């Protein structure tokens, strides 16, 4: 149909106005002295929140172009909640300051492709200057004392997160699960995690942890991508008997296949969640029997000559649970044998001696781990079901931060970690006039997450910001109480992974909007 | 219905104000310094893109006249890309410099027929001067260099593309599949390629590749028109069952059959794709029983008994993969005995020994070329999958270029070969002053490509173009860094076929546009 | 006043509108099948005229910028009235032809400073080609014929002209007046005529033929500029006693001098007209003396110690009749002695011999001519007051025409002279393609006069202008008749001076509006 | 400093433009030259602007520049304006 299409400044002034709406709503929640945002509930009383991640989700603009602006920054924002586990409310405001300054800079007639270069030049030299001033976590005094913070000083939650990482290695698989009644457990069991989530939402049947959770489920391992419902009927009506929920994992699931599963979940007739099959080509099939053995199940590809017609409950593997995220599947307590498993690794182990290549031996080295992995399974004691429900949520929040700190280390919070990189890489210039006015608007926009905090708390940000740079070390303002001093004595820090993420991600879409000369919407007529 | 019929400048003013709304969307994307274009999407985050084709595809217009202006160049511009591989972008911006200079000079009171002749005349020259300034590539060293270049200096992907040609000849058949994974393959297999394509979009099942890929497909060969729906539904059920998809290839598939099998391909199962059968009359019926043997199907002609209901699933051919462009169908690894094939090549071998008919001979040597030829298959490795889908496209396009390079050799690029040709015709003149003017507008119009390639980079384009005119041979500007040098030693060069096609096509429509005098559109009412 | 200013196109477009409105109402009256153009007058019933100068004067517009255009071509078109006699319309229909096509060629892109140079170079090389085909009228049979034709076929009026010019030379003074009654009359009397006309309209009492005219008046001569009405009263008063009229010649007037005279002369109480003195410096003093010894008055300034205050009507020279135009004063029948005259010449003679200097000696010869040669006076035959007032005009015209015929010869009329110079250089080009396109719109505009004449008659301009062009010599179309032939025999012919300058004037102003980038109007507020 | 220098290109540019030619290209040609080199805009060729006889008193060129730079500074540093009310 008719396409409304806009050019030049006219285009951008409507893009930026978009982000200046999204950002302003989100950034008000930022800081321990955040502000409340009321969100209208479709039926009943409204939500109240200081969660930028919540406010972001509900934001969509009436005007077509403004919206694209929002939806756009809103994307590479939530790139750092599916990569780090937080920091959308930072990336958003980092971007907002980069863009309303790239906007004005291009209107004044400076060269965009020079501006985009000096922003990226600055970001690049401020991430290496951020890794300079990082400080790894790795040992079980560090890890313990992170989780403690991540979940509001509860030393108990901090410990199990340290203890559970000490079971399965400090780059090993950890779930959390509902409790029994007061005080936390931490059993290791057979298990296997990989990098695929629900092929679409709707399956999602427990929005506290935004997933779909299955008790004592049948596991089906296919290699084809299933297009049609017809193929699955002797398995699906076979599964309604035994009264168990089914985990489909194939190469993919197209349309009229995935159509019915979504409609036959809601309306009750059998419980199902589909996921993609990890990897591609060869090592996929290797990874897709690497879990056939673990679940005591069988692969149903026609590469040995079995169809989904030729599938009876017996072929489908099993475990005590499976769960699945926006992306991330995790099978727990596999119904396979001591026999079949360590045997399969004994059969893999002696191909890592007999490896004719030196990349072939990475697949194997990480596959032996997966299948030799097990999984720490923290259960959440509380007293009064609500507390289990609400405490269990905070367990996963630390399990994220701590995990992602153990990946790049920890920097002082309160957006000082930025205004220390910022100050450090301070004189830096490039080829011309224009390329530095980039480096300038890229540095000045690194003040902006701390700036946002102070103001939310309602002090004069200029003078706190001057006063943070004016010190060094881990010194900073702690708008929590309102007094300055070593920010990690005060308990405040971010994973290094989340702070970098946000800045690189923000400057990505900063550059792509600065270098947008036209946009193509739909006509409202 | 009722029509709104517009005339003269009142009509010619709408069109051009409409190629301008399209050329500006698209020329924003042109060069190594191209600007981004945002395209709305009906749910989720707007697409960003530096690819003109994509942007071109999304431009319908509200006004029924301004839009015909649009859709007219939109076609002939995308001929050069169906026809060569690239140069849509180049063609749309060339056509803009001819239509706005032309329509201006018409409404000034010059005679529209002479202006076309002038344009026509000048283009022929530039073309015959563009054929001079073209180093060819036939030797194996050269084919390697051109492929390598056209996939981001991947020495290795240019190395295979060359090995593929040495194997199946210059004018052989070459496909690309998805790979083992990390490290690439090449193997020639006994398949066939005939020169028709998808008989409608919505059969496209690879929007990334305006192609329709099917694996293990049942192939139905039919020798007459398929216009019903109830007199063909049997064979559909059979497929739907026994999983496998279906390539129809009939004389024509039209009316109620196109409708029904189109909709339950975008829904339903069956996932069918239909093409017209190549050739006409007697050399048609033959060329179907050519691929019947190759696939192991039966050709279902009324002549030799069987009809359409009297068709099991085992009348049909099969092959391990087929793919079908807008323009070009290819069957790979036909499910046919080598005995049945070489045998058929036998019959056609001693059919070449039974024609005193120089041409009727070729029509047969064109079929032995097909059966004896097979199909070079570049399987693309990659590793870390999604890195395989990037690398699928780089190859597909580095093959497009390399093939049209062997055809008519290579020129320098960054739109410098069009100006090198401008400068080497100069004081060219016509029958009269209205024609000579036509000649001057087409010679100004060839600056456009370079001029826009600089304007995106954000330098003064009149300075930099003038500086390339005072140089000679391979002197040009490398927009991508800002250096002036030998374009070919920088590794920057269009195929000759694209530059030619683009310039010819652009001037083609511009001629028709200049000499339009009335448009007929359906009413807003 | 706050000013409204406009630019580039919407300037040149509003200027083209104004000239189009003036030229369309004017050209309507051109050639012998001229169209009536009603003009409303204050009270009574309107005027109906076939007279282009009559319509031209009446054209003012409301749009301030249109008006400025209309008045601009009015000015330099009516400088062929000032300069030659007729062609006020020709110059107008040429300018319009040059401009409505000029403006168009700027719009399309062509370079205004080159278009100007094209038109120039082409008129330069056609004003030559008009002399080349001029016939001269120098022998006294050809003067009377040119007389006859210009006075609408009357040898009678065409003869007195012929013998007027036998009397005083062809470069001598000749004047017309109301006549005794029936039968013309040729007197040759002592007189003078010079370089300056009335210093304002309002002095004009013979608007019948826009001139000032007085019977038996006093002449006042001054060296000095004038302001104080008071200095003048001893002779203003003096004349108010006798109620005779008066001429004031002086170095200037302006200010209070002119103010009071305008008023109390359109009161009727003592009529006067005031003119700039001829020349300047030594030769100005001498020439006021020259026309003292002619008028038997006195030069009046602190030179022979005589201020204006002391000078009575006795020190004032007199003649039987003065008369004065825009750019002309002509004193007839001087009071001064026959002796004092031939005595004054006898002194400038012995001065001529002494002057060892060229341009010196050119000036004195000029003055002894004025004095000696005197004036011819053509009193006009009548029968009924008004069939004389008319005839006077028919003479004044034929005299103007013939006087020009004498200097630069004569060419064929019906605007065929113009289309014969046109045709006599098609070859012609310019330094570049713009320049030529100027040459082209000049050559295509010299068709403008003939084209329009034909149309007023109702015949097909394109055909008739083709037949003329196909022929040679004096081969033209007599619009009254319908006949073609030798236009010289048909008695249709223009002086070369009017056809030449009518063209050059237009070319001059077409040059200016084409190269106009800004206009500045007094704000329609 | 750089916004002042781009202004000093402006006088040449606006003449070259007035002529009908290409401002950027022609100014780069003069910029690239040394000596008394320029662009005689009525002729249309390049040479010693002295030997073509095309000169400005140093004073008027100097004077022009400073007088512009003054009011420039003033209008940049302006913040409020007081004008009489329409009705």
CATH number at residue B397: 3.30.260.10
Using the Cβ of A515 and the Cβ atoms of chain B, whether some distance falls under 8 Å is answered with yes
E strands, A53-207, in order: 174-178, 185-189, 191-194
**By C-alpha distance, which of A29, A31, A6 is closest to A17?**
A6
**CA–CA gap between residue B72 and residue B11 (Å, rounded):** 14
Chain B: residue nearest A277 by CA? B385
Which residues of D fall within a CB distance of 8 Å from B460? 24, 28
The helix/strand/coil state of B252 is strand
Q: Are residues C367 and C380 in the same domain?
A: no
Count of CB contacts below 8 A, A vs B?
Answer: 102
**H/E segment holding residue D7:** helix D2-19
Using the Cβ of D76 and the Cβ atoms of chain B, whether some distance falls under 8 Å is answered with no
Which residues of B fall within a CB distance of 8 Å from A359? 182, 383
**CA–CA gap between residue A127 and residue A124 (Å, rounded):** 6
Which residues of D fall within a CB distance of 8 Å from C111? 20
- Compute how many other C-beta atoms are within 10 angstroms of the C-beta atom of residue A50: 18
B296 is in an annotated binding site: no
Phi, psi of C481 (to 5 degrees): -80, -75
Say whether B28 and A228 touch across the interface (CB within 8 A). Answer: no
Looking at C177-308, list the stretches that DSSP marks H as alpha helix, in order from N- to C-terminal side. 233-240, 255-265, 282-295
Q: Are residues B470 and B448 in the same domain?
A: yes
Binding residues of D, as ranges, are 40-42, 56
**Tokens representing residue B337 in the block:** 């005995």
Which residues of D fall within a CB distance of 8 Å from B451? none
Residues 6+ positions from B209 with CB-CB distance below 8 Å: B392, B393, B396
Chain C: residue nearest B437 by CA? C433
**CA–CA gap between residue C456 and residue C479 (Å, rounded):** 9
E strands, A364-486, in order: 375-380, 410-412
Q: Are residues B269 and B359 in the same domain?
A: yes
- Residue among C113, C117, C435, C515 with most chain D CBs within 10 A, to mutate: C113
Say whether B181 and A282 touch across the interface (CB within 8 A). Answer: yes
Chain D: residue nearest C434 by CA? D20
Say whether D22 and B466 touch across the interface (CB within 8 A). Answer: yes
**By C-alpha distance, which of C126, C216, C174, C152 is closest to C419?**
C126
Beta strands D37-40 and C218-222, pairing class = unpaired
Using the Cβ of D67 and the Cβ atoms of chain B, whether some distance falls under 8 Å is answered with no
Q: What is the spatial order of strands in the sheet that B174-178 belongs to?
A: B174-178, B375-380, B187-189
Q: Are residues A19 and A111 in the same domain?
A: yes
Q: What is the spatial order of strands in the sheet that C185-189 belongs to?
A: C173-178, C375-380, C185-189
Residues 6+ positions from D22 with CB-CB distance below 8 Å: B462, B466, D16
Q: Are residues B277 and B227 in the same domain?
A: yes
Chain B: residue nearest A227 by CA? B269
Say whether B437 and C433 touch across the interface (CB within 8 A). Answer: yes
Contact B144, B402 (CB under 8 A): no
Please spell the DSSP secondary structure of A392-407, one letter per residue. Answer: HHHHHHHHHHHHHHHH
Residues 6+ positions from A345 with CB-CB distance below 8 Å: A368, A371, A372
Chain B residues 445-484 within an 8 A CB cutoff of chain D: 460, 462-463, 466
Which residues of B fall within a CB distance of 8 Å from D24? 460, 462-463
Chains touching A (3+ CB pairs < 8 Å): B
- Residue among D17, D19, D20 with most chain C CBs within 10 A, to mutate: D20
Contact B236, B226 (CB under 8 A): no
Chain D residues 35-54 within an 8 A CB cutoff of chain C: none
Q: Could you give the count of Cα atoms lying within 13 Å of B46 in the half-sphere of its Cβ?
A: 31
C175 is in an annotated binding site: no
First to last CA, chain A: 10
Using the Cβ of D19 and the Cβ atoms of chain C, whether some distance falls under 8 Å is answered with yes
C30 is in an annotated binding site: yes
Q: Are residues B254 and B330 in the same domain?
A: yes
Phi-psi label, residue A169: left if phi above 0, alpha if psi -120 to 50, beta otherwise: left
**CATH number of the domain that residue C100 is part of:** 1.10.560.10
Q: Are residues B216 and B335 in the same domain?
A: yes
A277 is in an annotated binding site: no
Contact B240, B270 (CB under 8 A): yes
Which residues of B fall within a CB distance of 8 Å from A512? 36, 48
Using the Cβ of C440 and the Cβ atoms of chain B, whether some distance falls under 8 Å is answered with yes
The helix/strand/coil state of A278 is coil
Using the Cβ of C515 and the Cβ atoms of chain D, whether some distance falls under 8 Å is answered with no
**CA–CA gap between residue C234 and residue C251 (Å, rounded):** 20
Q: Using what technique was this structure determined? A: X-ray
Chains touching B (3+ CB pairs < 8 Å): A, C, D
**Which residues are bridge partners to D45 per DSSP?**
D40
Q: Are residues A316 and A433 in the same domain?
A: no
The domain of A338 spans 191-371
B50 is in an annotated binding site: yes
Phi, psi of A167 (to 5 degrees): -65, -65
**CA–CA gap between residue C282 and residue C299 (Å, rounded):** 13
Q: Are residues A128 and A232 in the same domain?
A: no
Could you tell me the resolution of this structure in angstroms?
3.2
Using the Cβ of D17 and the Cβ atoms of chain C, whether some distance falls under 8 Å is answered with no
Measure Cα distances from A509 to A69, A90, B456, C297 in Å.
10, 14, 19, 97
Q: Are residues C385 and C420 in the same domain?
A: no
Say whether C104 and B109 touch across the interface (CB within 8 A). Answer: yes
Which residues of D fall within a CB distance of 8 Å from B462? 22, 24-25
Q: Are residues A48 and A67 in the same domain?
A: yes
CA distance B109 to chain C (A): 8
Number of H helices, E strands in chain C: 19, 19
**CA–CA gap between residue B161 and residue B394 (Å, rounded):** 12
**CA–CA gap between residue C445 and residue D74 (Å, rounded):** 53
Chain C residues 86-115 within an 8 A CB cutoff of chain B: 101, 104-105, 107-109
**H/E segment holding residue C493:** strand C493-495
CA distance A224 to chain B (A): 10
A85 is in an annotated binding site: no
Using the Cβ of C431 and the Cβ atoms of chain B, whether some distance falls under 8 Å is answered with no
C31 is in an annotated binding site: yes
Contact A32, A480 (CB under 8 A): yes
Which residues of B fall within a CB distance of 8 Å from D25? 462-463, 466
Instruction: With an 8 Å CB cutoff and a minimum of 3 pairs, decide whether chains C and A touch.
Output: no
Distance of CA B512 to the CA centre of its chain: 22
Q: Give B484's DSSP letter.
A: E
Question: Which domain-ending residue is among B308, B343, B371?
Answer: B371
Chain B: residue nearest A7 by CA? B25
Q: How many domains does chain B have?
A: 3
Chain A: residue nearest B63 by CA? A2
Cα torsion B407, B408, B414, B417 to 10°: value is 180
Beta strands C218-222 and C246-250, pairing class = parallel
Residues 6+ positions from A47 with CB-CB distance below 8 Å: A38, A39, A41, A54
CA distance B467 to chain D (A): 9
**Tokens representing residue A236 in the block:** 């699906």
Q: Which residue has the tokens 């203890």?
A: A163
Q: Are residues C229 and C311 in the same domain?
A: yes
The helix/strand/coil state of A192 is strand
Which residues of D fall within a CB distance of 8 Å from C438? none
Chain B residues 270-289 within an 8 A CB cutoff of chain A: 271
**CA–CA gap between residue B171 and residue B369 (Å, rounded):** 10
A242 is in an annotated binding site: no
- Residue among B36, B44, B47, B71 with most chain A CBs within 10 A, to mutate: B36
Distance of CA C310 to the CA centre of its chain: 39
**By C-alpha distance, which of A325, A110, A319 is closest to A210?**
A325
């Amino acid at each position: 149909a008719a396409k409304d299409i806009r050019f030049g400044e006219d285009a951008r002034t409507r893009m930026v106005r978009g982000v200046n709406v999204l950002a302003n709503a989100v950034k008000a929640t930022l800081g321990p002295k955040g502000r409340n945002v009321v969100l209208e509930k479709s039926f009943g009383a409204p939500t109240i929140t200081k969660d930028g991640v919540s406010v972001a989700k509900e934001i969509e603009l009436a005007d077509k172009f403004e919206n694209m602006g929002a939806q756009m920054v809103k994307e590479v924002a939530s790139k750092t909640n599916d990569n780090a586990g937080d920091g959308t409310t930072t990336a958003t405001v980092l971007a907002q300051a980069l863009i309303r300054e790239g906007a004005k800079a291009v209107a004044a007639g400076m060269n965009p492709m020079d501006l985009k270069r000096g922003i990226d030049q600055a970001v690049k030299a401020a991430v290496v200057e951020l890794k300079n001033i990082s400080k790894p976590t790795t040992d079980d005094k560090a890890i313990a004392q992170v989780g403690t913070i991540s979940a509001n000083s509860d030393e108990s939650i901090g410990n199990i997160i340290a203890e559970a990482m000490k079971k399965v290695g400090k780059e090993g698989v950890i779930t959390v699960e509902e409790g029994s009644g007061l005080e936390n457990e931490l059993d290791v069991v057979e298990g296997m995690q990989f990098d695929r989530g629900y092929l679409s939402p709707y399956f999602i049947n427990n929005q506290q942890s935004q997933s779909a959770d299955l008790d004592d489920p049948f596991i089906l391992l296919h290699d084809k991508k299933i297009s049609n419902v017809r193929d699955l009927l002797p398995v699906l009506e076979g599964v309604a008997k035994a009264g168990k929920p089914l985990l489909i994992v194939a190469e993919e699931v197209e349309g009229e296949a995935l159509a019915t599963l979504v409609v036959n979940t809601i309306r009750g007739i059998v419980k199902v969640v589909a996921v993609k099959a990890p990897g591609f080509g060869d090592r996929r099939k290797a990874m897709l029997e690497d879990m056939a053995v673990l679940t005591g199940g069988t692969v149903i590809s026609e590469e040995v000559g079995l169809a989904l017609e030729k599938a009876t409950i017996k072929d489908l593997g099993r475990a005590k649970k499976v769960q699945v995220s926006k992306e991330n599947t995790t099978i727990i307590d596999g119904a396979g044998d001591s026999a079949a498993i360590e045997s399969r690794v004994g059969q893999i182990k002696t191909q890592i001696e007999d490896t004719s290549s030196d990349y072939d031996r990475e697949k194997l080295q990480e596959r032996v781990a997966k299948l030799a992995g097990g999984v720490a399974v923290i259960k959440v004691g509380a007293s009064t079901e609500i507390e289990m429900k609400e405490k269990k949520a905070r367990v996963e929040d630390a399990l994220h931060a701590t995990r992602a700190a153990v990946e790049e280390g920890v920097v002082p919070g309160g957006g000082v970690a930025l205004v220390r990189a910022l100050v450090a890489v301070g004189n830096l210039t490039g080829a011309n006039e224009d390329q530095t006015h980039g480096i300038q608007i890229a540095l000045r926009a690194m003040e902006a997450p701390l700036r946002e905090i102070v103001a939310n708390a309602g002090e004069e940000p200029s003078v706190i910001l001057n006063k943070v740079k004016e010190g060094t070390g881990n010194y900073g303002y702690n708008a929590a109480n309102g007094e300055f001093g070593d920010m990690v004595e005060f308990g405040i820090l971010d994973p290094t992974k989340v702070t970098r993420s946000a800045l690189q991600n923000a400057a990505s879409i900063a550059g792509l909007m600065i270098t947008t000369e036209a946009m193509v919407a739909d006509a409202p007529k």
